[PDB]
Structures are given as structure tokens and as C-alpha cells.
């Protein structure tokens, strides 16, 4: 125990006085700074670099001064005092407080107000979505793990034990962003990683604990930290005082206390929603709640992909929603001690689909590099996949087919069972054949279509699947149908209740979402939506009570943007399945001058362009207006030469005359003279081919031009590239 | 700029004090931390230089005979936490904090700045800016 106050003069040595307080140090060891004992010295040197004298001081202190002295009982979350007995390395090497503070400079801006949706004493956890969680079977046995030995299992609720958390949990040390806060010790449950060019997000979830590090290449990083309501955290500031400064976040809740590490509180974030994200975990333990609020905001930014291709505030909100969803699922499972099979399968699918939209649309990164990884201790996907592989290898209603494909898509290494794809093919075709009859799809059908698409687009065999099914999705999208589908999305969002019901995208889905048409945003089709609006009486009432008649035209344009901006705007999806379009240096491909693209046989595809085509075999339709023309090009991979073809004319054989089909494989293209495009119909079968031969007697509206105006003209597109006109 | 590896060896304690300010000679430097599981076991002394342009903190070891430069504000903030506990006591400690109270009073204030953009890796790679 030695305190020594010196004065430095010149370079020899320094005058001082020694004041040992309560104990003994070797006083003759003050000549040469004690490295000998197990103690440690502090030397504070004030010397003006101008070669003045100044002074220094010394305190020799002992060693031990450095070392430290369901329910939250058995598994706690323990804060660490300092960097000494925890990971020291990042808390030294860090540039924090030197180049920047992760915190806003003013300590007043730190504490935030808790949002209304945050938990209270009456509702210690929060709201739960209405299709409420099924209770544990009273007399039954909880399996140690999730399993399915049968097809009946994927339908009925199947339960398994949470005992993975009590045994297989891992004690690990967590280091918050930039050493902004001192290390935190938690008992791990799961870890989520979503990566891209434009951004990466790291999610660490544990008992009463969550850490989501959200980072954009184009913006500031932020780290969301969730710890139990009791736990206090100490921020790292420059002040060497022994006082305490609580890192940015609201007051603690009835259950959890939430912290926000980042500078976005005022300086960066667009709104006062800095308190909105902090209230995320305290809203619900129901993972469906967060994935609903993730799905809703997912669509909204696709419409707005025009002005800003990069939505920064929509990247953070969505990501934080993904992270808090898994945190809810671990914690709902630790609390209620039982899990559900369809809860574990979901987070596998939700982690794919929501990550894709997260990075591609929100972050802006090339969809080519989008990837994600999930390790959950209570989920063993690799096994589930093998249990599935033997299920396929051992008539299907749309409900049964949804569950088979959803669980086929949720678990994949890219390896999909042959009977899984062969199911998906059967699904689409059966939606198609019915859609050339009726005008709309029910939620059962809508969901069935979604995963069927996501399955076939997931991975010259598997490639030929992506093309032919892109036609089918495009073909089902007609000016008649699109106005119904875009109407569904608007009714779904207007009658949406975030609190009491789960919003999901496959519920609002439509072939137009999986279609390549960039033209549905044209004034023709848009104004057809507005006049199709009153057809759903409740919808037209609610729309006029908020948005101005000018805003409704815009809002209807916004929801028409989705269909064009979903699949068709994906550059990675295009490049793989239609390289021919992009082969020779082409403006129209990357300038979006190609309005619509139809995959032909290998090496070839049709296309539709407004302006002067610089490539391909061009068929121009002369019946169309000068300023708004229509040109059906036929592109080739290795053939970049430009030329012109001849529109020919054939007729239709009597439907019952030739029981042989030479027509099938062709496309029926109906359009007006306004330059607008209406119906792309593929002739799949002789049953459809016969329907073409009957004008007015057809069950298929585009084939019968007695249901249209006098502007309706028909073109027959061929796999050859041949372009013909029907006489009739 | 002329960078810094974060570590220079020193056999004697008198040389640490005489060591010219790193901020004066160089432009931008990296901080490094010793390769030892428990700092306390290895640690010998903490030398903090106030008046330097970017006031520097030097951690020195004897038997290794090395001197490392670590984050000036964090290190001393981190120190005051371990020696600032309620359970801890003694007059040796009371002398530490009193001298540790006004440490930065005379020197250049910390950053009011904002961190540059880009992805942030976890603490595995030490907040590496790599996206993948």
C-alpha cells in the first residue's frame, strides 16, 4: 500500500514524498517501479510536450482489486463488472470513444419513452395473436424432439419437449457493440445469421436474453439488447468517475428491460420510432405477432422501391422483427415448457423468405449473395429433412399439398425429393387450368401456389423448370385477374388487424407476384383497378375514409407496382432463367425497356418492347397506335443479329375434327389498339385448344372476343418464334 | 499515414515514461492487447500519459517484457469499474479513485463523432467491417 506524489523536472529523476497508508511496500522498491510484487502500479503523467516540467503521480494498488467479488432463478443473465474477467481484447482494441461514441453525445437523449404497445403490469408479456396456441395434451407424452412418421402428423398439432433448453443450453459470454457496454453472460438457446453485400445481421438468443446486431453497408450499425427487467447495464463513457450512466433504452418493463446500442436515436432515424424498436420484444411472446408485422411492412417497401431502391428505416424495422420473433419462440418455449412442430418448421421458412426480401429490397444487395444460417438447440432441421426424405419415398387436396410443400421448402439444403417437385408441377398446372375459367383464388389456393413457386425457383433439368413455370405464372396474370389480385392485397391491408390476427404474404399471393410483366403499372390497367374497386363494397368504403381520391389513384398504383417489382424486377432470377435476353450488350434488358418476357424453348425467348428493338427477330403489330406500339421480338442466346419476320395467318380446325393436337405449346396474346396488353394465355392441352376453336362458346374469356370491345386483336405465338394470326 | 502495430517492447520502466507520444510521431495507430488469458496474472503496471494529443494508456508486463497500447478512455473506465465495486474497500483503493477522478480533466475530450457506415462483424473478429 503506497501512494506517491511526484514532481518531474528534467530528465534524471523526480522529487516526491511517500505516504504509505495502511500497509507495507518495499520503500526501496519505489526507486525502480515495482514489477516484483503481485501488485500493480498506476502512473498518471502530465508533461507538456513543449518540454515543460509538469508533474506525475503514482498509486500502487494490490491485485485482487481487479478481480470481481418458468423462472430466472436457475438460469440467470449476469452482467460483468469490467473487461478484466471477461473478454478483454475487444474492449482495448476498440476505437470507441476515440474516433466515435456508439452512443449519442448527449446523455439526456438516452432514456426513451416506452411505446403504448409495450407490456404493462396487467399484461406482463403482451398481446397474443387470436389463432391461439394449443394447450399440452393432458394424458399424452411430450416427445424429446419434433418428429413426423406420417402425413397426418403435419396437419394435426404435434408437440415436443422443451427439455433441450435445460440440458443442452450453452453458457457463453456476449460482447455488445464496440465495447459500448461491458460484457454480458447468458445461457444460449439459438443463433441466427443473415448475410448479404449491403448488410449482415447477427442474432444471439438465450434464456431471458437477445442480441441482434443490425448492420448495413449503406448505413449505421445498431445493436438491440434484451435482458430481464431486473438487470441493469453500465454504459462505457470517457468519464473516469465511479458513477453510472444507463445506455439508451426505455424504463424496464414488467418482464424484460430493453437496450438500444446505436446513434440513431435522434441524429439518424427518420422518426420518433426510435422508441418503437425498443418496444418490439415487450409487445409479444407470440412469434406470429412479430412475423406478421414483418410481413406487412415487407410488401409496403416493394411499392416504394421506385423512389428509393434502398429503404434504410425498413431494413432495421424488418430485421429487428425477425430477431425478436425467434427470441419470442425460444422464450415462449422455455416459459410454457412445450413446443409445436409447426412452430419450428415455420421459423425455417420465415428465415428464408423474409431474409430474401430483407437484403434484396431493403438493403439493396445483389440477390445472388443473399444467404442465411440458423442454429437452434430445440430444432434439428437436418434430421427433420431426413424424416421428410423417407416420407416422400414411401389426389391431394390443396390444404394437404400446402403443408407438404411448405415443410418441403422450409427444410432444404437445396436437395429436394423427386416426389416433392413432381407435386409442385401438379399444383401449378391445376391452379392454371382452373384460372382460365374463374377470376379469383381463395386463401387455400393462394398459399398453395406460393410454396409451389418457391420450391421450383429454389435451385438443363432444374433450369428448364424455372423457365416453363415463369410462363405459367405470367400467363395466369391477366389484366382481368390482376385487378382482382391487387384488390385482394388492398382489402387485406385495410381490414388487417396487427394485434389480433396474423398477416402473411402467401395469403395475399397471386400468379402476378410470380409473373414477368412490367406493364401492369400502365395507366390503362391502373384505371381499370379503380373502376373495379366498388366491386368489393366494404373495400371502397374504407379506402375513401382515409385517403384522398388522388391518394387512392396513387395507392392503387402502389399495389400494382408489386406484381412488376416482385419476380420481374429480380435481376438474379432473370439472369439465370433467361440469359438470352441479356446475352449481347443490351440496353432494353437493363433499362427495363422490355415490358414483358416469355421464355421459349432452349436458347430462345420472346419479348415485348415499346421502343426501337436493337436485337432479335422483330414482329411489329401495325394495328397499334404509333406512340404506344407493340413489338414481339424473338431473342436468341448466341444470335444477336437484328432482322424482321413475317406475320402469317392460319385457321383453327374443327374442335372435334382433329383429335390430334399440333397447337399445344403455343401462346395466345390478346391486346388492344391502345398499345395496352391484356391476356397472355398458353394453350396447355387439347381441352384448351378446343376451347379456342369456339368463339363465344368458350369458357375461357380471352378466347371469346364477344366479351371484349372492337379493339381486341389476337396473335398466336409459337415455340419456333413463328408469329401467326387467327382468322375469325 | 504512418501506422503502428500497437506494441513495442520495453525492458525498463524508466523508458516507458520517456517514450515520446505516439500521436505526435504517427497519424493513425492501432491498439493491441496482450496474448494472455488472465491480464491480472501477467500484468505489472499501468502508465497513463495525459497531455499527449490523444492521451495514451500503456499496459506493461515484466516477465514478458512488453508494453501494449490500449484504448485510453475505455481502459481507465474499465479499471475504475473493477476497483469501484461496493464490496471492495480499503484506503489503498480510496487513493486510486481520487487520483483517477480528474484524470482527463486537463486533457483533450473524447469523440463527439459518428462511426462510418458499413456492415459490422460480431466480436469474434472484433467488429470487423466485413459483410461476409
Amino acid at each position, epitope marked *: 500500500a503506497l501512494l506517491r506524489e511526484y514532481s518531474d523536472r528534467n530528465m534524471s529523476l523526480k522529487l516526491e514524498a511517500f505516504y504509505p497508508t495502511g500497509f507495507d511496500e518495499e520503500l526501496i522498491k519505489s526507486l525502480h517501479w515495482g514489477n516484483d510484487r503481485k501488485h500493480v502500479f498506476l502512473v498518471i503523467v502530465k508533461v507538456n510536450p513543449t518540454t515543460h516540467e509538469g508533474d506525475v503521480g503514482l498509486v500502487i494498488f494490490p491485485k485482487y482489486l481487479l478481480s470481481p467479488y418458468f423462472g430466472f432463478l436457475s438460469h440467470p443473465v449476469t452482467p460483468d463488472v469490467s473487461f478484466f474477467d471477461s473478454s478483454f481484447a475487444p474492449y482495448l482494441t476498440t476505437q470507441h470513444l476515440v474516433a466515435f461514441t456508439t452512443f449519442p453525445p448527449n446523455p439526456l437523449v438516452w432514456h426513451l419513452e416506452r411505446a403504448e404497445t409495450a407490456a404493462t403490469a396487467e399484461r406482463p408479456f403482451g398481446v397474443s395473436l387470436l389463432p391461439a396456441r394449443p394447450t399440452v395434451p393432458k394424458n399424452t407424452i411430450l416427445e424429446h424432439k419434433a418428429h413426423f412418421a406420417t402425413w397426418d402428423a403435419l396437419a394435426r398439432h404435434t408437440f415436443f419437449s422443451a427439455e433441450a433448453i435445460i440440458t443442452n443450453s450453452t453458457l457463453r459470454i456476449h460482447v455488445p457493440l464496440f465495447g459500448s457496454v461491458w460484457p454480458i453472460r447468458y445461457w444460449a438457446t439459438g443463433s441466427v445469421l443473415l448475410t448479404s453485400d449491403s448488410g449482415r445481421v447477427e442474432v444471439n438468443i438465450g434464456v431471458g436474453f437477445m442480441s441482434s446486431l443490425i448492420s448495413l453497408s449503406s448505413g449505421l450499425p445498431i445493436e438491440l439488447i434484451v435482458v430481464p427487467h431486473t438487470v441493469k447495464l453500465n454504459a462505457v463513457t470517457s468519464d473516469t468517475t465511479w*458513477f453510472q*450512466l444507463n445506455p439508451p433504452g426505455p424504463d424496464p418493463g414488467p418482464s424484460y428491460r430493453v437496450y438500444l446500442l446505436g446513434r440513431g436515436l435522434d441524429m439518424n432515424f427518420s422518426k420518433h420510432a426510435t422508441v418503437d424498436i425498443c418496444a418490439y420484444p415487450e409487445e409479444s411472446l407470440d412469434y406470429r405477432y412479430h412475423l406478421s408485422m414483418a410481413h406487412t411492412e415487407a410488401l409496403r417497401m416493394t411499392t416504394k422501391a421506385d423512389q428509393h431502391d434502398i429503404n434504410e428505416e425498413s431494413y432495421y424495422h424488418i430485421a429487428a422483427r425477425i430477431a425478436t420473433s425467434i427470441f419470442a419462440l425460444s422464450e415462449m418455449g422455455r416459459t410454457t415448457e412445450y413446443f409445436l412442430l409447426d412452430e419450428i418448421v415455420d421459423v425455417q421458412y420465415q428465415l428464408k423468405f423474409l431474409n430474401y426480401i430483407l437484403m434484396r429490397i431493403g438493403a439493396g444487395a445483389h440477390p445472388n449473395t443473399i444467404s442465411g444460417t440458423s442454429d437452434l438447440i430445440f430444432a434439428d432441421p437436418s434430421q427433420l429433412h431426413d424424416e421428410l426424405s423417407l416420407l416422400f419415398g414411401q389426389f391431394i387436396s390443396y390444404d394437404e399439398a400446402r403443408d407438404q410443400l411448405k415443410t418441403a421448402y422450409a427444410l432444404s439444403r437445396g436437395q429436394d425429393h423427386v416426389n416433392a417437385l413432381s407435386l409442385a408441377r401438379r399444383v401449378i398446372m391445376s391452379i392454371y387450368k382452373g384460372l382460365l375459367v374463374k377470376q379469383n383464388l381463395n386463401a387455400t389456393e393462394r398459399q398453395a401456389l406460393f410454396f409451389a413457386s418457391m420450391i421450383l425457383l429454389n435451385f438443363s433439368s432444374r433450369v428448364l423448370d424455372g423457365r416453363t413455370t415463369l410462363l405459367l405464372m405470367t400467363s395466369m396474370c391477366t389484366a382481368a385477374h390482376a385487378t382482382q389480385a391487387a384488390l385482394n392485397i388492398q382489402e387485406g391491408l385495410a381490414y388487417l388487424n396487427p394485434s389480433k390476427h396474423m398477416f402473411t404474404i402467401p395469403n395475399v399471393y397471386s400468379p402476378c407476384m410470380g409473373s414477368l410483366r412490367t406493364d401492369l403499372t400502365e395507366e390503362i390497367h391502373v384505371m381499370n383497378l379503380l373502376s373495379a374497386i366498388p366491386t368489393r363494397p366494404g373495400l371502397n368504403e374504407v379506402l375513401h375514409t382515409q385517403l384522398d381520391e388522388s391518394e387512392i389513384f396513387d395507392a392503387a398504383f402502389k399495389t400494382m407496382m408489386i406484381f412488376t417489382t416482385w419476380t420481374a424486377k429480380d435481376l438474379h432470377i432473370l439472369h439465370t432463367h433467361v440469359p438470352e435476353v441479356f446475352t449481347c450488350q443490351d440496353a432494353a434488358a437493363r433499362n427495363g425497356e422490355y415490358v414483358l418476357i416469355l421464355p421459349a424453348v432452349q436458347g430462345h425467348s420472346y419479348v415485348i418492347t415499346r421502343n426501337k428493338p436493337q436485337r432479335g427477330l422483330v414482329y411489329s403489330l401495325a394495328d397499334v397506335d404509333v406512340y404506344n406500339p407493340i413489338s414481339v421480338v424473338y431473342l436468341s442466346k448466341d444470335t444477336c443479329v437484328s432482322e424482321h419476320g413475317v406475320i402469317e395467318t392460319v385457321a383453327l380446325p374443327h374442335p372435334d375434327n382433329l383429335k390430334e393436337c399440333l397447337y399445344c405449346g403455343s401462346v395466345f396474346l390478346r391486346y388492344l389498339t391502345t398499345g395496352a396488353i391484356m391476356d397472355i394465355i398458353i394453350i396447355d392441352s387439347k381441352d384448351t385448344e378446343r376451347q379456342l376453336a369456339a368463339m363465344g362458346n368458350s369458357t375461357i374469356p380471352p378466347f371469346n372476343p364477344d366479351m371484349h370491345g372492337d379493339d381486341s386483336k389476337a396473335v398466336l405465338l409459337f415455340p419456333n418464334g413463328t408469329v401467326v394470326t387467327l382468322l375469325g | 499515414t504512418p501506422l503502428f502495430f500497437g506494441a513495442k517492447p520495453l525492458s525498463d520502466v524508466s523508458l516507458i515514461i520517456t517514450e515520446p507520444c505516439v500521436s505526435s510521431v504517427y497519424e493513425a495507430w492501432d491498439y493491441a492487447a496482450p496474448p494472455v488469458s488472465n491480464l491480472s496474472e501477467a500484468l505489472s503496471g499501468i502508465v497513463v500519459k495525459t497531455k499527449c494529443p490523444v492521451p495514451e494508456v500503456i499496459l506493461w508486463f515484466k516477465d514478458k517484457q512488453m508494453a501494449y497500447w490500449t484504448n485510453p478512455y475505455v481502459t481507465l473506465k474499465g479499471l475504475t469499474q473493477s476497483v469501484g465495486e*461496493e464490496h471492495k474497500s480499503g484506503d489503498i483503493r480510496d487513493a486510486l479513485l481520487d487520483a483517477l477522478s480528474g484524470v482527463w480533466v486537463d486533457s483533450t475530450p473524447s469523440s463527439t463523432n459518428i462511426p462510418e457506415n458499413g456492415c459490422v462483424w460480431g466480436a469474434d473478429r472484433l467488429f470487423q467491417r466485413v459483410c461476409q
Partner: antibody
Amino acid sequence: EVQLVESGGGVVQPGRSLRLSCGASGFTFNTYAMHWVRQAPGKGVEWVAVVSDGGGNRYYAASVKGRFTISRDNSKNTLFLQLNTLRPEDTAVYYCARSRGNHYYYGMDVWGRGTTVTVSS
Amino acid sequence: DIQMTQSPSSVSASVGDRVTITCRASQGISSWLAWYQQKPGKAPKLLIYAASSLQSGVPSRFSGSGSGTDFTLTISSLQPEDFATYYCQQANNFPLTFGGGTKVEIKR
């Protein structure tokens, strides 16, 4: 409505001890740090000591660093002050106040009544 | 240690006039200054804890500003109940602080 009532004072011959306590009304003592603030008659205001939350590290002012003993516990809401030695110049009015937050930036929102310590026989 | 110099030493104005009392400091301290009001015989009372940050039962008439060197207290509308002495505190650096104080005596 938060109140603090001080108990102590009187007159004590030079070179002796006095213990000034402080009561806490409505406030939880285990939350925020406590100040002792001195004002001499006709003179100005001079801060003296801070006790960290609960029993803990206490910062002492320049003048009295050797002669002052400060301690507080969260049981009876008792924050004492012991002047063991300094006789002559310590005659003044002592206040007990509580810092706004834990941090020192915001000063002391809460205040006590007062205690008058005098030095004579 | 930091020395606080308060200016002016005394201010006597009429009711409703704007009164301005600043506080100086030896150190180059950043932000927070704490204003108090002691009426004679009365215990002190907090007014503003940073610059413009006034909260408590004391009326909202008062205000403040300044950065890095000097920090000012401004009374928008003076009232007869405002007669007291005004001390300032500098919390930016700990070792100890307080102002000399400024007496305000209401005039006519």
C-alpha cells in the same frame, strides 16, 4: 412530494466530533447518491461530499479530506456525517441533498431543511 | 480544482425586465451547469440542471444557454417573488465546484 429532515447540530468545543444524520421522506434511499453541502454565514455555497448508491465509494471535497467521515445505509435511510477533528473554520450551516439522477451532471433536485453547527463554550 | 466566476455580482431591476446572470469557469468545460435559488433564511432550490433544461415547481419563465466557456441564465419576465441570491454549479468536471453567487434585489 419528497422531503428530507436533518437531525444534528448544537455547539461543540474545538477539536471534537459530531454526527449529523438525515431522514428521507417518500424517497427510496437505495436509488440515488446523496450530497452534503455546506454554507457558512454570510458566505456562499460549497459542496462537501457524495455517497454512492448504498454503502460505497464516497467522493470527498478538497478542504476536509482528512477530517471527514461519511457513511450511509439503505435500512433506516440514515446518511450520517462525522467530523472527527477540524475545529475552527467548520462553523457553518450544513445541508443534505440528493443528486437528480445518479450522475453528477444534473446536480441536486432534492433538498433538506437544515442544521446549524457552531463552535464555542 | 475549478474556480467559478459569476457576473455581474449584483443586479437590481424592475418587475418584468429581462435579467441576465452568466457564470464563468477556469476550465473549458463542455455543457452542464446547475442553477440554484436561495432566498434569505430559506434552503436552496434547483432551477435549471443543464442550460435550457428547467423542470421543477419553479415557473417556466426562466431559461438559459451557452456552450464551452460561459453559460447564461435569463429571466424572461421578472417577478417580485424572484428576490434571492443566485449560485451556479459546474458539474462537467468533478473535484468540486460552485459559483460565487449573485444577489438580485428587486427595484423601483
